[PDB]
């Protein structure tokens, strides 16, 4: 048996951040990784046609200080996603160019409903503790309804309900009827709320890494050398003896003081446990699926949309569109002109039936109509990745909680099981679902183990992160009118009173 | 490597039924069972205090002809669950004795609401094909709603909503807000409707096996001998080569022409596949949890409830009661007097934190109140099983579908993956979730392999079952008034 202090299961950003912190603290770590590569839900493809492209996790932004610090220490740089020209909101077959993070509306009644929808998501968010969403005062009531039921109660206009539906689909790669209202409200609040999560400039989608996000996991692998074991899927964890035994699919045995599970929670199911998991984790890892997404990148000779004063951002409502959201994916140098689009939730299932060529054709025709541009029909190259296919991911971007599960099972997500500690973005309390959350969770799990070993006091398990000097965070602000304009039901109450 | 015609993964009723059919046709079968026992979600414990007790699946009834034929061939007999005396509905702190399958109501508005709720479950089921619930005309509408939403829409009275909620909790060991309305309506319809699924006399709970349901899987293991490998959890399936390779956790390798997966769908996640599973199956097996239940049996010196003209059936509304439903578990001789109770769904999760003795005390004080008898406070023995604990079940009774999953992934459940065919009660089209469904799905999956081998024609894969001579089904009837009384909003539209 190969002996060490800590086995880390999974060489994603979370596992690799954990392994590096333990290695830096002078412990002997092994990383057991299922795939022939590190990075997990991050994957940077390199070829002559694209140079490099993120097929998984890509965007970082302000308030994501841990992934920024980690990446800067490994010698990586960021650049800004193109948001110089106009965004497009495409609704009912027509494109409406706009500026600012929120797609605007002119109908006064529709304006009240839209303003009240975003405001109410944040209002409800402020009731939900980041580190214990089940302690929200109405946790039970909100967890026992889907986001569909919540939008049916909140949205007094089809226009707000359609944009709200797209917001859920895009943010968590799941249908409104699939997800807990409590869990979704938590997810948005723990990323800093509606404006921060939806924004390119000043939000989640502001930046990409020069050379791709896969470099984070690769460069930590370089520092760890042969401590990373590729094509070692873990099958078996035994805690009945003094040292934890960890067995891989190729029959290798690792022996450790402690284990970090840095895999998506449900992929816990791929491991046979001795003794059996406690009841609540046993059931929790069968109740927490990952969302569905195809990330598609169409290449063009030039970023032609910019010549029409379009930045490349498209927000596209409704059923017929294969893609509901795009960003400019052009290199910072201005070359390898490209549009990144997501095929979301049920469409990732429905359209997987097509060939790569048939999906490229549908995306080109959509982009031609939305951009009013025949050049969109002249792609030079295409890359895509259906994350629904991945045995060792289960989906992307992250784990969603169906109705009733977060209040019954949420406590056990990062609860240690004897000498097993839980990392993975899903166990984060800030930007859970993101690369940021992966770094928070890996470092926190590593420090739980350092605490258990008596190397650090308890108050060092959770540590705040200094703000990036490279990517300073502009605060989120509201106007007086945004704060106090009535809802549609509010307005009707005012009317009736008069 | 150990070579055979078919490896069956799982030695529950479904895997054993499949293995027996294939063995009987002259194929060399191996059954790989993760546990040190067969039976899976069935488990019969024997000791001097109980003689025998079903701690998992127990009840069989009319229209369940496959489990009744298989058990009969294995030498098993049934006896009737005691329903001679009165059932009890305990509502707002008081016991209301009754007869007939449906707890009655006296308020005329509440009466319209109750009548409408049961009738509407069956009306909606009539449009849901048993073999394809996703082809229901309103499949997407019904799938994108929870049973909580449907009950909030349908039930104008708290009385009807409390009993409908208990119905869902009892039937599928899950909360109304956890489950798809489409999936739940399918589940009821594919057991023959509300009356058939809730009934003791002439329904699903009519009978038990003399000596326990465990004997079904045990006696098929007896027939198959050392073709059954106990403590062989399957970890890896490789279909890249000429023969399928199946590896176990103890590093044994089995080589076969075909595989039957006879495990709960989600427990497919415990197996690493080469090549990877197709996308839709890869995601489906992360979306399909099993429900939560503690099955509890309190033993008494005598079936004392019978002295008060109670049969031992208790229907107990509300949050406070640990147990919402009981049946008499007394043996047919009138000895080993016992009450079987279920601790359902969230209560299985909440009350798991207590000790065994603390659960016994709560159950005995509840039974004392409902049965109005101090004798309930004097148990002679207790047995219980928390099915939430089981690494190789994931829960009980069966797999539930959360909103949106059945329409998007339902077609995947019995779709073959190269030379892997799918058994398990979850894949049945009649009494899916039951021992009956297990037999249906095991035999159908075995016959899919006999067809792939050219041994039987396509039209023999699915096979009707002659009706049991021992347990014949009596028709389900309704009254003129049940069919035609208006709903509450019906009565309001008239006013
Ligand atoms: C898929 C995706 C996700 C994503 C995104 C777009 C797509 C298409 N966009 C993002 C974005 O722009 N910005 C961002 O910050 N996040 C974005 N995401 C999410 C992001 O990729 C993830 O949150 C993050 O990468 C997750 O990191 P974590 O380290 O927690 O998880 P992982 O990447 O899944 O790594 C787990 C590793 O474990 C291995 N594995 C699995 N099972 C085993 C077993 N049994 N034994 C050993 N190793 C195992 C996996 O192979 C993986 O490497
Ligand atoms: C738990 C339970 C279920 C139940 C019930 C009450 C409770 C508390 N009441 C029932 C009732 O009164 N009447 C009835 O008809 N059903 C009732 N049920 C449900 C019933 O028990 C089940 O529907 C039925 O037993 C299901 O059988 P099936 O054969 O489909 O599935 P299983 O019993 O779970 O068997 C699966 C076997 O596979 C083994 N396993 C699991 N993973 C592996 C791996 N990786 N490798 C090898 N073997 C594996 C399991 O150990 C099990 O033996
Ligand atoms: C008069 C009926 C209006 C329905 C409006 N919607 C938005 C559909 C529901 C509001 C629910 S709530 O009334 O705010 O609870
Ligand atoms: C009154 N409840 C029963 C709450 C809703 C009526 C159902 S409906 O939605 O109005 O038909
Ligand atoms: O929540 C998000 C966007 C919401 C939104 C944007 C524009 C208009 C309305 C909603 C959003 C969240 C995450 C991602 C990521 F991580 F995958 F890249 C992309 C987008
Ligand atoms: O649906 C069931 C009973 C429903 C019911 C009975 C009386 C009043 C209201 C609902 C019911 C379903 C299954 C089981 C079993 F086989 F798992 F034990 C037991 C009971």
HEC assignment per residue over chain B: CEECCEEEECCCHHHHHHHHHHHHCCCCEEEECCCCCCCCCCCEEEECCCEEEECCCCEECCCCHHHHHHHHHCCCCEEECCCCCEEEEEECCEEEEECCCCCCCCCHHHHHHHHHHHHHHHHHHCCCCCCCHHHCCCHHHHHCCEHHHHHHHHCCCHHHHHHHHHHHHHHHCCCCCCCEHHHHHHHHHCCCCHHHHHCCCCCCCCEEECCCCHHHHHHHHHHHHHHEECCCCEEEEECCCCCEEEEECCCCEEEECEEEECCCHHHHHHCEEECCCCHHHHHHCCCCCECCEEEEEEECCCCHHHHHCEEEEEEECCCCCCCCEEEECCCCCCCCCEEEEEEECHHHHHHHHCCHHHHHHHHHHHHHHHHCCHHHHCCCEEEEEEHHHCCCCCCCCCECCCCCHHHHHHHHCCCCECCEEECCHHHCCCCCCCHHHHHHHHHHHHHHHHHHCCCCCHHHCCCCCCCCCCCCCCCCCCCHHHHHCCCHHHHHHCC
B266, A249: Cβ pair inside 8 Å? Answer: no
Q: Whose CA is nearest to atom 6 of ligand 4?
A: B153
A94: Cβ contacts below 8 Å, ≥ 6 apart: none
Choose from A292, A404, A407, A415 for mutation: most chain B CBs within 10 A.
A404
Asked if residue B361 lies in contact with residue B255, where contact means CB atoms within 8 angstroms, the answer is no
Three-point CA angle B232, B235, B238, nearest 5°: 115
Question: From residue B32, how far is each of A55, A249, B6, B203, B261 by CA, in Å?
Answer: 39, 18, 11, 34, 10
Rounded distance between C-alpha atoms, residue A474 and residue B128, angstroms? 54
Task: Give the pairing of strands A258-261 and A6-9.
Answer: parallel
Distance B416 CA to ligand 2 centre (A): 21
Name the H helices within A275-335.
279-284
The helix (run of H) or strand (run of E) holding residue A256 is: strand A253-256
Could you tell me which residues are beta bridge partners of residue B382?
Answer: B298
Same domain, A252 and A309: no
Instruction: Name the nearest CA neighbour of A60 among A221, A215, A264.
Output: A215
CB contact burial B359-381 (16+ within 10 A = b; e otherwise): bbebbbebbebbbebebbeebeb
A72: Cβ contacts below 8 Å, ≥ 6 apart: A468, A470
The domain boundary residue, chosen from A171, A198, A225: A198
In the Cβ-directed half-sphere of A227, how many Cα atoms lie within 13 Å? Answer: 27
Could you tell me which residues are beta bridge partners of residue A91?
Answer: A94
Same domain, A87 and A203: yes
Say if A477 falls within a structural domain. Answer: no
Phi, psi (degrees; rounded to nearest 5) at A16: -70, -40
Same domain, A415 and A430: yes
Rounded distance between C-alpha atoms, residue B9 and residue B234, angstroms? 7
B434 CB neighbour count, 10 Å cutoff: 26
Q: Which atom of ligand 1 is nearest to the CA of A14?
A: 29
Residue position matching structure tokens 């659960």: B359
* Residues 297-316 (B) with a CB less than 8 A from some CB of A: none
CA A251 from centroid of its chain's CA atoms: 33
Q: Which residues of B touch A146 (CB under 8 A)?
A: 146, 403
Q: Quick check: helix, strand or coil at residue A366?
A: helix
A95 CB neighbour count, 10 Å cutoff: 17
Asked if residue A383 lies in contact with residue A356, where contact means CB atoms within 8 angstroms, the answer is no
* Residues 244-263 (A) with a CB less than 8 A from some CB of B: 249, 251
B132: Cβ contacts below 8 Å, ≥ 6 apart: B410, B411
Q: Which residues of B touch A144 (CB under 8 A)?
A: 148, 175, 177
Instruction: Name the nearest CA neighbour of B221 among B230, B234, B208, B213.
Output: B230
B144, A177: Cβ pair inside 8 Å? Answer: yes
Residue position matching structure tokens 């005062």: A137
The domain boundary residue, chosen from A198, A221, A247: A198
Same domain, A272 and A168: no
Three-point CA angle A151, A157, A161, nearest 5°: 35
Say if B414 falls within a structural domain. Answer: yes
Instruction: Name the nearest CA neighbour of A305 among A258, A333, A340.
Output: A340
Asked if residue A218 lies in contact with residue A229, where contact means CB atoms within 8 angstroms, the answer is no
Q: Which atom of ligand 1 is nearest to the CA of A271?
A: 45
Cβ of residue A389 closer than 8 Å to a chain B Cβ: yes
Nearest CA in chain A to B395: A283
Rounded distance between C-alpha atoms, residue A364 and residue A373, angstroms? 10
Same domain, B205 and B293: yes
Say if B21 falls within a structural domain. Answer: yes
How long a stretch of residues is chain B?
495
DSSP A440-452: HHHHHHHHHHHHH
A112: Cβ contacts below 8 Å, ≥ 6 apart: A485, A486, A487, A488, A490, A491
Rounded distance between C-alpha atoms, residue B331 and residue A374, angstroms? 80
Rounded distance between C-alpha atoms, residue B401 and residue B413, angstroms? 12
Asked if residue A170 lies in contact with residue A342, where contact means CB atoms within 8 angstroms, the answer is yes
Rounded distance between C-alpha atoms, residue B265 and residue B288, angstroms? 7
Choose from A246, A286, A293, A319 for mutation: most chain B CBs within 10 A.
A286
Name the H helices within A240-341.
279-284
Residue position matching structure tokens 């609704």: A91
Around ligand 6, the residues with Cβ closer than 6 Å are: B 59, 103, 167, 170-171, 197-198, 204-205, 315, 397
Asked if residue B280 lies in contact with residue B407, where contact means CB atoms within 8 angstroms, the answer is no
Same domain, A204 and A320: yes
To the nearest whole Å, the CA of A355 is away from the closest chain B CA by 14
Q: Whose CA is nearest to atom 3 of ligand 4?
A: B156
Asked if residue B277 lies in contact with residue B345, where contact means CB atoms within 8 angstroms, the answer is no
To the nearest whole Å, the CA of B398 is away from the closest chain A CA by 13
B406 CB neighbour count, 10 Å cutoff: 27
Rounded distance between C-alpha atoms, residue A139 and residue A135, angstroms? 6
Q: Quick check: helix, strand or coil at residue A391?
A: coil
Task: Give the pairing of strands A272-274 and A234-238.
Answer: parallel
The domain boundary residue, chosen from B401, B421, B445: B401
Same domain, B436 and B415: yes
The helix (run of H) or strand (run of E) holding residue A143 is: helix A139-143
Asked if residue A409 lies in contact with residue A266, where contact means CB atoms within 8 angstroms, the answer is no
Q: Quick check: helix, strand or coil at residue A32?
A: strand
Handedness of CA A478, A484, A488, A490 (dihedral sign): positive
In the Cβ-directed half-sphere of B6, how many Cα atoms lie within 13 Å? Answer: 34
A479 CB neighbour count, 10 Å cutoff: 9
Say if A339 falls within a structural domain. Answer: yes
Asked if residue B34 lies in contact with residue B386, where contact means CB atoms within 8 angstroms, the answer is no
Task: Give the pairing of strands A310-316 and A325-328.
Answer: antiparallel
Q: Quick check: helix, strand or coil at residue A364?
A: helix
Asked if residue B228 lies in contact with residue B38, where contact means CB atoms within 8 angstroms, the answer is yes
Phi, psi (degrees; rounded to nearest 5) at B386: -95, 105
Question: From residue A384, how far is each of A119, A147, A360, B276 by CA, in Å?
Answer: 35, 29, 9, 18
Residue position matching structure tokens 């039209």: B459
Rounded distance between C-alpha atoms, residue A297 and residue A384, angstroms? 6
Residue among B43, B60, B170 whose CB has most ligand 6 atoms within 8 A, to mutate: B170
How long a stretch of residues is chain A?
498
* B29: its two tokens: 């079968």
Say if B467 falls within a structural domain. Answer: no
B403, A408: Cβ pair inside 8 Å? Answer: no
Same domain, A419 and A329: no
> Does residue A398 have its Cβ closer than 6 Å to ligand 1?
yes
Q: Quick check: helix, strand or coil at residue A315?
A: strand
Rounded distance between C-alpha atoms, residue B316 and residue B298, angstroms? 17
B147: Cβ contacts below 8 Å, ≥ 6 apart: B168, B176, B177, B179, B180, B181, B184
> CA Rg, chain B, in Å?
23
Phi, psi (degrees; rounded to nearest 5) at A427: -95, 0
* B168: its two tokens: 């869902």
Rounded distance between C-alpha atoms, residue A465 and residue A447, angstroms? 14
Asked if residue B4 lies in contact with residue B256, where contact means CB atoms within 8 angstroms, the answer is yes
Q: Which atom of ligand 6 is nearest to the CA of B342?
A: 18
Could you give the number of structural domains in chain A?
Answer: 3
Rounded distance between C-alpha atoms, residue A14 and residue B399, angstroms? 32
Question: From residue A396, how far is each of A33, A124, A175, A425, B245 by CA, in Å?
Answer: 18, 26, 14, 12, 30
Same domain, A177 and A307: no
Number of helices and strands in chain A (H, E): 16, 21
Same domain, B283 and B417: yes
Rounded distance between C-alpha atoms, residue A183 and residue A130, angstroms? 11
> Does residue A117 have its Cβ closer than 6 Å to ligand 5?
no
Say if B476 falls within a structural domain. Answer: no
Rounded distance between C-alpha atoms, residue B394 and residue B378, angstroms? 34
Task: Give the pairing of strands B44-47 and B29-32.
Answer: unpaired
Asked if residue B160 lies in contact with residue B117, where contact means CB atoms within 8 angstroms, the answer is yes
* Residues 146-205 (A) with a CB less than 8 A from some CB of B: 146, 148-149, 175, 177-178
Say if B482 falls within a structural domain. Answer: no
B470: Cβ contacts below 8 Å, ≥ 6 apart: B68, B72, B78
Number of CB pairs, chain A paired with chain B, less than 8 A apart: 131
CA B440 from centroid of its chain's CA atoms: 13
In the Cβ-directed half-sphere of A362, how many Cα atoms lie within 13 Å? Answer: 18
Residue range(s) defining the domain that contains residue B441: 1-40+62-77+210-288+402-462
Long-range contacts of A467-471 (CB under 8 A, 24+ apart): A467/A65, A468/A62, A468/A65, A468/A68, A468/A69, A468/A72, A470/A68, A470/A72, A470/A78, A471/A60, A471/A61, A471/A62, A471/A64, A471/A68, A471/A78, A471/A206, A471/A207
Q: Would you call the peptide bond into A113 cis, given omega within 30 degrees of 0 as the criterion?
A: no
Same domain, B183 and B49: no
* Residues 277-296 (B) with a CB less than 8 A from some CB of A: 277, 279-280, 282-283, 286-290, 292
Say if B189 falls within a structural domain. Answer: yes
Asked if residue B423 lies in contact with residue B46, where contact means CB atoms within 8 angstroms, the answer is no
Q: Whose CA is nearest to atom 14 of ligand 5?
A: A171
Residue position matching structure tokens 């997500």: A413
Q: Which residues of A touch B291 (CB under 8 A)?
A: none
Question: From residue B151, how far is each of A101, A329, A485, B165 by CA, in Å?
Answer: 39, 47, 35, 8
> Solved how?
X-ray
Distance B183 CA to ligand 6 centre (A): 17
A492: Cβ contacts below 8 Å, ≥ 6 apart: none
Asked if residue B152 lies in contact with residue B144, where contact means CB atoms within 8 angstroms, the answer is no
Same domain, B31 and B122: no
Rounded distance between C-alpha atoms, residue A275 and residue B402, angstroms? 29
Of residues A143, A233, A270, nearest to B269 (C-beta): A270
Three-point CA angle B42, B44, B46, nearest 5°: 170
Rounded distance between C-alpha atoms, residue A312 and residue A82, angstroms? 8
Determine if residue A251 is left, alpha or beta; phi over 0 gives left, psi from -120 to 50 gives alpha, anything else beta. left
Q: Whose CA is nearest to atom 42 of ligand 1?
A: A392
Q: Quick check: helix, strand or coil at residue A12?
A: strand
């Amino acid at each position: 048996s190969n002996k060490c202090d800590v086995v880390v299961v999974g060489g994603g950003i979370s596992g690799m951040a954990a392994a590096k912190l333990l290695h830096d603290s002078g412990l002997n770590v092994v990383v057991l990784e299922a795939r022939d590569r590190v990075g997990g839900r991050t994957y940077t493809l390199r070829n002559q046609k694209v140079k490099y492209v993120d097929l998984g996790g890509s965007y970082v932004g302000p308030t994501q200080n841990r992934i920024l610090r980690l990446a800067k220490e490994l010698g990586l740089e960021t650049y800004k996603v193109n948001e110089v020209e106009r965004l497009i909101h495409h609704v009912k077959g027509k494109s409406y160019p706009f500026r600012g993070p929120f797609p605007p509306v002119w109908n006064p009644i529709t304006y009240l409903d839209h303003n009240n929808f975003w405001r109410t998501m944040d209002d409800m968010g402020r009731e939900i503790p980041s580190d214990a969403p089940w302690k929200a005062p109405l946790a039970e009531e909100w967890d026992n309804m889907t986001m569909k039921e919540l939008l049916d109660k909140l949205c007094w206009t089809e226009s707000a309900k359609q944009l709200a539906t797209l917001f859920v689909n895009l943010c968590v790669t799941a249908e409104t009827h699939e997800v807990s209202a409590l869990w979704f409200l938590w997810y948005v609040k723990q990323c800093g709320g509606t404006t921060r999560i939806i924004s390119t400039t000043n939000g989640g989608q502001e930046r990409k890494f020069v050379g791709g996000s896969g470099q984070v996991s690769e460069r930590i692998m370089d520092l760890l050398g042969d401590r990373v074991k590729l094509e070692r899927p873990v099958i078996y964890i035994d805690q009945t003896r003094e040292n934890v035994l960890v067995e891989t699919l190729n029959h290798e045995m690792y022996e450790a003081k402690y284990v970090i599970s840095a895999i998506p929670p449900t992929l816990g199911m791929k491991i046979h446990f001795n003794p059996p998991l406690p009841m609540m984790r046993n059931q929790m890892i069968t109740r927490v699926p990952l969302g569905s997404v195809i990330k598609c990148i169409v290449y063009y000779k030039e970023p032609f949309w910019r010549k029409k004063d379009y930045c490349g951002t498209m927000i596209i409502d409704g059923e017929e569109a294969p893609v509901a959201y795009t960003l400019d994916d052009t290199k910072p140098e201005g070359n390898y002109a490209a549009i990144m689009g997501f095929i979301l939730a049920h469409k990732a299932r429905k359209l997987a039936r097509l060939t790569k060529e048939e999906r490229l054709k549908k995306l080109c025709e959509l982009y031609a109509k939305v951009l009013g541009s025949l050049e969109a029909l002249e792609p030079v190259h295409y890359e895509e990745k259906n994350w629904c296919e991945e045995q060792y991911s289960g989906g992307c971007y992250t784990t969603y909680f169906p109705p009733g599960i977060l209040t019954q099972y949420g406590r056990v997500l990062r609860q240690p099981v004897d000498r097993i500690y839980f990392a993975g973005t899903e166990t984060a309390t800030h930007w859970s679902g993101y690369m940021e959350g992966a770094v928070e969770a890996g470092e926190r799990a590593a420090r739980e183990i350092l605490h258990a070993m008596g190397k650090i006091p308890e108050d060092e398990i959770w540590q705040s992160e200094p703000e990036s000097v490279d990517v300073p965070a502009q605060p989120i602000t509201t106007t007086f009118l945004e704060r106090h304009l009535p809802s549609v039901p509010g307005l009707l109450r005012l009317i009736g009173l008069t």
